[PDB]
């Protein structure tokens, strides 16, 4: 239940940049979507937004967005990922 | 008073570089609050530094300011938007 | 042992990387084992992938492959590099 | 004790970076130091190495250096700068 | 936080009158010695004697389950949220 | 998660039920009696007397040993995973 | 990191030395015994008598509460920061 | 890793050697009583009576201070590197 919360609150986190990127940036869902997993994950790979208002929106969705983010990692890391190879190992 | 204060020293630092690259870099604000944001978050999907002194502030910037900004986010995560989702899951 | 394993899982997941971004992405191999490592690592100073699948891929990557990344980058911080420089001082 | 020597390892490998990315890559020195500085800390917010020695040397870099670069940060952190507003809160 | 150490709080002095009714009616104990057989239980100090009544025996093995993670739970956050605070503003130079 | 406290609550009654069958059989006390002497040894509250036989006191000392970070890996799970959540349920306004 | 293993020290001292002046002027205790009823119980070790008055027993209630955190303080910071080291550098080769 | 545990386990054995030692000549302890006295002085259970002479005293509180972190570190390491990975490989079905 803590991995489906952490997962569900993630996709929806995701699909809420997918849907801002797409419109208000002009990407296309794909590239939206990437822009906003490389933005949370930290890895920023990308150019920075060329709007304004994509530029407010990514400072306000990288305080809020990363923290959840980080934290389904770190519970698929360590709950889901791990188990797998430390059982078999 | 803990997520006052996080959030404070977050606000302030914030404050600081944006004065900063908005003179020294000749960002207008909106871009040097960007990157101020985008460089202490280390998503970094920015150009760097232009001038060597804002390559210099920026080197201190990101050591002195990391810590405070993953220490608010760390807080504002797992104090302000946890329990939300949690008490109501 | 868990120092090797960590070693291996990583290797491997470097090595499937570079198999996919030296074949999908046209990198050579050692430019696909950078992007692969400055990726997981969440350091991203390159461009996005250009393929549609690349950004698929880096996307399901990421998620896979930062938790064990960091995992053994923490583990050879706090059991081999840390103990040498310990010890000694 | 405990902040200098971690302040001072991460000087030397600061130092390090910028002896080498100020030869081999050729950088001045102050944007070699900046290079260093914003990989390990993982903002990575400049292009990538042009030279393959550049890239092997990033790839090693990054790995021995990312952990005590942000172990320093933190203690840094919560040692240095958080007693100071703590104390003073 | 504080929230957290009112709550931690209460529920404690909760557990602890639990057990001092028990023990002062079960075991026939006065309630300030059911009070400290509760207190040094949960807090794993032990220095007295045992439950005489089987049922006094039975409700001390759940009482120190249930009862020995909040207990703990509170010295700890009455530790790093009240007293540690108060010391590092004690020793403050003025 | 929840097959961990599963897990832990069984090692548990296991690890119970064997110093119960033990201090009943060597020590010669009742099961009631060598259930709650295996649990106050275990969390270390100790307010019976120690052991009397030599074996007794050989088995005491391991199974303190290996005893102890299994019970409190439970009392922390139980505690963190079953009650802490449930306390939370608790306080929510309806 | 001293400093933080210096105060937790006097701070500790302090401790014992108020339930030393207190059960050995209360309970009558002579101060050598009253300092270890202070060090066995605050460690939750345990193994003396109970207070024989009321006051000894709302003390050593109050006292557990406030001090046990402390004192577990102390051994792990003194384990984790002036013994492990030490350990360290006795186990390295020359 | 290992060589941690290794080294806690000596460590650990030596520091019950050394009680055993002093209990058994200081107290009139027979060393398996010395041993155990040590063991559930260090553990915190304490389910023994306090020391006898003066000299047996200062040491316990000086025993405690200086040996319940390295026990307790043990009994950690023992916990997680040892006893889980074992339960763990114990659970897998084949």
Same mark, same amino acid.
């Given at each position: 239940?803590?991995?489906?919360?952490? +997962?569900?609150?993630?996709? *929806? /986190?995701?699909?809420?940049? %997918?849907?801002?990127?797409? $419109?208000?940036? !002009?990407?296309?869902?794909?590239?939206?979507?990437? +822009?906003?997993?490389?933005? *949370? /994950?930290?890895?920023?790979? %990308?150019?920075?937004?060329? $709007?304004?208002? !994509?530029?407010?929106?990514?400072?306000?969705?990288? +305080?809020?967005?990363?923290? *959840?983010?980080?934290?389904?990692?770190?519970?698929?890391?360590?709950?889901?990922?791990?188990?797998?190879?430390?059982?078999?190992?």
């Amino acid at each position: 239940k803590e991995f489906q919360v952490l +997962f569900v609150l993630t996709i *929806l /986190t995701l699909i809420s940049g %997918t849907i801002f990127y797409s $419109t208000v940036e !002009g990407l296309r869902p794909i590239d939206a979507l990437y +822009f906003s997993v490389v933005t *949370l /994950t930290t890895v920023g790979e %990308t150019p920075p937004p060329q $709007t304004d208002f !994509g530029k407010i929106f990514t400072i306000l969705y990288i +305080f809020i967005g990363i923290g *959840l983010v980080f934290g389904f990692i770190h519970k698929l890391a360590v709950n889901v990922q791990l188990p797998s190879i430390l059982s078999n190992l």
